[PDB]
Every structure is written in structure tokens, then in C-alpha cells.
């Protein structure tokens, strides 16, 4: 139970119910690398569905019941055997308690039953960590899974701008977006409408260059990785299963020719969106999330594991590297055509 809870000293930066947000921290005194991980867990987009979430998913809307510690797993593990990539880094787990895909900038008030402060939570965590050693960092990797992976895409450049404006231009900010790269595709039998409604409910904010492209009322576009990624300046590594279970869920998929063609076309479209993403890991598996699973080391694409690919990415950010690839996208067209896919 190696990561210790700190509730935010600025108690106006809150979870949905107005309780303070926070972060779990395990410092590594001999390290200038910082990993800030954004938890996922869907979202809620109106009073009624947020009230439902508060009844049965309250840890995602409140800190009142959070434990004092959490165990770092996968990329958050400090054990080299579990985390070949960054086992010696300073580790931060930021709980998702804003239900806004990390985009919100709205306080609880006379007119708002809930606070949606995901974007401000990240910025407040960063600011408070600067007093705890982040000021000496050489690399800040903002990582996240599921809604947290989309959160990376929405927030990585804002973290880079925050540190520049605070006078730390030497800290290299990078993103690792796991399982947050979705397609606004046709369903097999309204995802984009729920986000459009959510953005208004949350006062959601998107990266500036993406906002300027799509403009007022169209900011929902920036929640889709293939549209927001080209607008970003920070290096971002994209991890995405080609047949992501959450993508299939929103597509109303739960095998005859129509569905076979649908699934194959989904994998093809996902692969196509990653063709010009130089740092990516996209196995042909039906699964969801990878980076904080203890067995995250097991999956390989073209014989290369994700921890290896991430290490190769670090080297590339010091022309391609002999035997140390960073772009790893499966080409086989059906779930589990890659033998290293997770079993479940
Ligand atoms: C509904 S269109 C969309 C597009 C981009 C991000 C999101 S948010 C989301 C989507 C799927 C998922 N699975 N697990 C988890 O946390 N999430 N979060 C939604
Ligand atoms: C606390 O956070 C809010 C919202 O981000 C900010 O407006 C305010 O200035 C902060 N207070 C302090 C003392 O930093």
C-alpha cells in the first residue's frame, strides 16, 4: 500500500459533491521522473444520471470514503519485475471524482448541484506537487486509462503551459493515453450527444488549438483522439486495443456476416487513425485498459512489449532506433489474432 493520500490544500478544488479532491503519492528521492496517472470511470451528464452515479459509484464523485493508501500496480508499481519501464519514478495516482472526463471547470453553487472540476484538479495537483519535489523534475508523464486516457489528451498541453507560465520551462511534459482513443462511428444497432450535453453541464474545457478549429458548440469533437491529437504539441504515446470493449459497448455490440464485417471494419478504422501516430501500441485484442494492470508486461505487438515500447519512446525523445520500435499497431483483423492478448 505504497501511495499515500493527500487531499488538496486548496479545498475549493473539489470532487462532484464538494469534498476535497486529492492525489496519492509515492516519492522516489533519487528520481527526476514524475508519473501522474488519471483514473477513469465513465462520466455523468445531467442531474438524474449524476444522482444515480452518486448512489452506487460514490467513490467516483466524493473523497469522503477514500482510503489513506493505494497500492501502485502496473506502470505505477515500484518493483522492476512488474514495471520494467519506470519503476524508480515518483508515482502519483489522481482519483477521478469529477465525472467530466477530466474536462470540467465548474464549482458547486446555488445553481449547480455538483462541481465538475477535473481540469482544475489536475492543475491544482501539479501546483501542489511543485512544492513536494516536482520543481526538480526532468520529465512529467501525464498518463491515464479510459476516461483518464481521454483526460490526458485534453489536459497534457495545459499542464505544459502551466509549468511554462509558473517558470519551469525545463520540465518536459509528455502524455500517455491508454484506452481513451475512441471513434465517433456508426453503431452496430447517443455517445456524441451525451458528451455535447456533458460539456455544457460541466463547463467543459478542451485544448485551445482544437477549440479554435471546431469552434462554439462543436467542442465535443475534441474528445475524440484522432481529432484532438493532431492539435497537440506535447509528445503523446497512444495505447489502444483495436477492439476496445468500451468502444464496442457504445457501438451496441455484445458471429454472422454483418457483425463480422462491422468488427473487422472497426479494427481497420482504428488502425487507420493511428497510421500517422508515431508513438503508439495497438494490439488486435478485445479488452479494455492496460497500463495499471499487474500483467501489463505480457502483451506484445510484433514481439515488442508495451514497457519496451515506452522505453524506446524515452530514447527517441533524448531517426528510428535499431530494434527499439515505438510505433506498434497490429495488422491482423480479428480479436485475439495476436496470441499475447489478455485472456480474461
Ligand atoms: C461516449 S463518446 C466518448 C468519447 C471520448 C471519451 C469518452 S469518456 C469514456 C468512454 C468510454 C469509457 N470506458 N471506460 C471509461 O472510463 N470511459 N470513458 C466518451
Ligand atoms: C484555489 O483554486 C481556485 C480554483 O482553481 C482558484 O481560483 C483559487 O485562486 C485557489 N486558491 C488559492 C489560495 O490558490
Curated annotation (Swiss-Prot):
Keyword field: Glycoprotein, Hydrolase, Phosphoprotein, Secreted, Serine esterase, Signal, Wnt signaling pathway
Glycosylation sites: 10
Cell compartment(s), UniProt: Secreted
Inducers of expression: Up-regulated in hepatocellular carcinoma (HCC) with high intracellular beta-catenin.
An example Gene Ontology molecular-function term: palmitoleyl hydrolase activity
Tissue: Rarely expressed in adult normal tissues.
EC number of this enzyme: 3.1.1.98
Chief localization: secreted
Record field: catalytic activity: [Wnt protein]-O-(9Z)-hexadecenoyl-L-serine + H2O = [Wnt protein]-L-serine + (9Z)-hexadecenoate + H(+)
Catalytic residues identified in the record: 146 (charge relay system), 244 (charge relay system), 288 (charge relay system)
Protein origin, superkingdom: Eukaryota
Protein function: Carboxylesterase that acts as a key negative regulator of the Wnt signaling pathway by specifically mediating depalmitoleoylation of WNT proteins. Serine palmitoleoylation of WNT proteins is required for efficient binding to frizzled receptors.
Similarity annotation: Belongs to the pectinacetylesterase family. Notum subfamily.
UniProt protein name: Palmitoleoyl-protein carboxylesterase NOTUM
Gene: NOTUM
Span covered, complete protein: 87 to 451 of 496
